Amino acid sequence: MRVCVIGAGLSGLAVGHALKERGISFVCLEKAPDVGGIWRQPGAGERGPGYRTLHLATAKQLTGYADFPMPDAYPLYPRHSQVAAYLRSFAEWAGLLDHVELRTEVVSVRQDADGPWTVVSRGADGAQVSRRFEQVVVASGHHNEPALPDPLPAGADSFAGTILHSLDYRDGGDFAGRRVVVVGLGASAVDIAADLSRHAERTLLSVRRGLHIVPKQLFGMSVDEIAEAPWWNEMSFDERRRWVEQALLVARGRLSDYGLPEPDHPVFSSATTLSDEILSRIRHGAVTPKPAIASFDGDRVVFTDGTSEPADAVVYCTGFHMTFPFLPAGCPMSADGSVELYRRVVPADRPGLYFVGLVRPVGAITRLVEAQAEWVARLVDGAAVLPAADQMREEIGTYLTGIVQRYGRTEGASIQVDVGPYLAEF
Ligand SMILES: Cc1cc2nc3c(=O)[nH]c(=O)nc-3n(C[C@H](O)[C@H](O)[C@H](O)COP(=O)(O)OP(=O)(O)OC[C@H]3O[C@@H](n4cnc5c(N)ncnc54)[C@H](O)[C@@H]3O)c2cc1C
Ligand SMILES: NC(=O)c1ccc[n+]([C@@H]2O[C@H](COP(=O)([O-])OP(=O)(O)OC[C@H]3O[C@@H](n4cnc5c(N)ncnc54)[C@H](OP(=O)(O)O)[C@@H]3O)[C@@H](O)[C@H]2O)c1
Numbered sequence: 018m019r020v021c022v023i024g025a026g027l028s029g030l031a032v033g034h035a036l037k038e039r040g041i042s043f044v045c046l047e048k049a050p051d052v053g054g055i056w057r058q059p060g061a062g063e064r065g066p067g068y069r070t071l072h073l074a075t076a077k078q079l080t081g082y083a084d085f086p087m088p089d090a091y092p093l094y095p096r097h098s099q100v101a102a103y104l105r106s107f108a109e110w111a112g113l114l115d116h117v118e119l120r121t122e123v124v125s126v127r128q129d130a131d132g133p134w135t136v137v138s139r140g141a142d143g144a145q146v147s148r149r150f151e152q153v154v155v156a157s158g159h160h161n162e163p164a165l166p167d168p169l170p171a172g173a174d175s176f177a178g179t180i181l182h183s184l185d186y187r188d189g190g191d192f193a194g195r196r197v198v199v200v201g202l203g204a205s206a207v208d209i210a211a212d213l214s215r216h217a218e219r220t221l222l223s224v225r226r227g228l229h230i231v232p233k234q235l236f237g238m239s240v241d242e243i244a245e246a247p248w249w250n251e252m253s254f255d256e257r258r259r260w261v262e263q264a265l266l267v268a269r270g271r272l273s274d275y276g277l278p279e280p281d282h283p284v285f286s287s288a289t290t291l292s293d294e295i296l297s298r299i300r301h302g303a304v305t306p307k308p309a310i311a312s313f314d315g316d317r318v319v320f321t322d323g324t325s326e327p328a329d330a331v332v333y334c335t336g337f338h339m340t341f342p343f344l345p346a347g348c349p350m351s352a353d354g355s356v357e358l359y360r361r362v363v364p365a366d367r368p369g370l371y372f373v374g375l376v377r378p379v380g381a382i383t384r385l386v387e388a389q390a391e392w393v394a395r396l397v398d399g400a401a402v403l404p405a406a407d408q409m410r411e412e413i414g415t416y417l418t419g420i421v422q423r424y425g426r427t428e429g430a431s432i433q434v435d436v437g438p439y440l441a442e443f
């Protein structure tokens with residue numbers, strides 16, 4: 018009655034925990050058959066951003082809910098199945114499933130002239146129902162629409178094999194004894210390459226720009242555990258930038274020595290894929306570096322340096338787009354399309370709406386959504402207030418004009434945050 022929470026991933030869950038602790042009535046509508054978000058999908062063969070080999074890249078203690086520790090036998094990087102089974106164990110403990118409508122997908126959301134909102138949801142019977150609520154929190158994710166390159170390289174329609182996106186990938190056992198291209202240097206790209214490097218007769222990583230490849234451990238310490246140590250927070254922003262450069266060199270060496278393009282920017286300048294595996298697959302011959310796909314010649318793939326190779330599939334690890342279709346009116350958007358959310362959560366012109374988890378931090382997202390949830394729980398029953406709308410559009414203007422001095426102009430920088438100072442204001 019009081020709050021519709023869209024989505025039962027890691028964030029929607031932290032939301033209900035906040036509202037329930039406080040006394041607010043709410044429901045959680047999710048389209049999937051259970052709770053968990055993306056972490057439910059590969060353990061169930063469902064089409065999604067993940068794959069049957071995915072693990073956490075962040076330390077378990079820094080990633081679990083601070084009131085519900087993970088099972089002590091979990092390793093530092095649990096498998097996607099361990100994670101999903103843990104997220105349902107919180108919903109059971111914290112007391113929330115009676116509020117959760119599974120297999121119920123939200124289709125429409127519109128603000129009514131008098132203040133409440135009208136949510137239309139389609140369920141399992143493929144049918145429809147309209148409802149009214151006081152407030153609404155969006156917790157749907159930002160990895161839902163895949164971003165293919167525009168355009169495809171010439172001749173893609175006369176290709177012998179299949180062309181697919183990382184969202185369609187599950188296991189390489191489906192590419193056993195075939196020959197595959199992987200497009201991208203992202204988090205999914207190196208993971209799927211390394212998986213295909215043990216099933217396909219031959220795997221190739223096509224790359225157009227260089228990113229800094231970093232292992233998930235320096236001095237036995239996870240990269241995000243290093244982040245919290247005080248001697249790291251003791252160093253300056255140029256001291257630690259080099260501390261890292263020196264260490265990387267000792268651990269892996271230089272990237273052009275593996276056949277890979279040098280990034281055109283120092284560390285922290287928008288580039289870090291984490292992987293314990295990808296370089297060693299290259300030094301073992303299991304994956305071969307290529308330079309950008311230029312045309313589809315029949316059953317072969319022509320690249321930009323003139324080389325060519327027989328291939329039966331191309332898996333595109335090119336990322337995702339941020340879309341909210343149940344919001345007829347466009348979601349937090351500006352002119353150039355930068356996100357405009359006061360403190361990365363609240364719209365300025367739409368009382369009663371909130372977005373949780375639309376933030377990209379360095380490391381675990383959890384303590385960030387926890388603060389977002391706890392604050393929003395006090396803005397719903399009045400224990401918390403907001404600035405006037407003008408004064409709110411100024412904080413946003415300050416956040417944006419200042420993030421161009423760090424990543425310059427691009428597309429997904431508008432939700433980039435520093436875990437340290439962000440959580441200090443909650
Ligand atoms: C490949 C990948 C690897 C990651 N690795 C890490 C990592 O190692 N460490 C880390 O800390 N973070 C990691 N993250 C980030 C973070 O853990 C995830 O974004 C996390 O799942 C956040 O969950 P969420 O609730 O924000 O969103 P989601 O997981 O997307 O959950 C949102 C839910 O909304 C539901 N939904 C969507 N639309 C509707 C609708 N219209 N009606 C009803 N329900 C709807 C979906 O079914 C989904 O369950 C990773 C992200 C990705 C994509
Ligand atoms: N858990 C983690 O470790 C982690 C880390 C960072 C982000 N994430 C989140 O999780 C998501 C999963 O990462 P991801 O690997 O799927 O996405 P990603 O990090 O955005 O990877 C995209 C890759 O595709 C390339 N690419 C994009 N458009 C291209 C084009 N038109 N032609 C050629 N190459 C192109 C990019 O190189 P270019 O630079 O040339 O575009 C880049 O190498 C990310 O989108 C992000 O939201 C997770």
Ligand SMILES: CC(C)=CCc1ccc2c(C[C@H](N)C(=O)O)c[nH]c2c1
Pocket residue numbers: 074075231240284285289291377378379380381382
């Ligand atoms: C050593 C140093 C350069 C590490 C830099 C770094 C490490 C991890 C991430 C992530 C992953 C996180 N799991 C998420 O996307 O939610 C996003 N950006 C990152 C930057």
